[PDB]
Write a structure and sequence with these properties.
Blueprint (H helix, E strand, L loop, with lengths): L2 H5 L14 H4 L3 E2 L2 E2 L11 E4 L6 E5 L17 E3 L4
Length: about 80
């Protein structure tokens, strides 16, 4: 599992292109560091995302090693970081 197919195959960003743009646009960021579309992710880690409306930093709860996580078990592997 990698940031490429991790957050792109969970239900966050759906697209149809053989060329990873998230890694080019500057959205792919692991551990507060820019990463390409070939960087493997780990459990209990962080997941940054760059957008035009604002930035989002999620956290990996675990790595189930899945291909396309539907809208059922896609709420126990990654979640938006926060401090209440």
């Amino acid at each position: 599992m990698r940031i490429d197919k991790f957050l792109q195959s969970v239900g966050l960003v759906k697209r149809r292109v053989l060329a990873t743009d998230m890694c080019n646009v500057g959205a792919v960021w692991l551990n507060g560091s820019c990463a390409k579309a070939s960087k493997e992710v780990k459990a209990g880690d962080t997941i940054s995302l760059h957008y035009l409306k604002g930035i989002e930093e999620y956290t990996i709860l675990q790595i189930p090693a899945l291909k396309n996580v539907p809208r059922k078990d896609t709420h126990l592997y990654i979640a938006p970081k926060t401090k209440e």
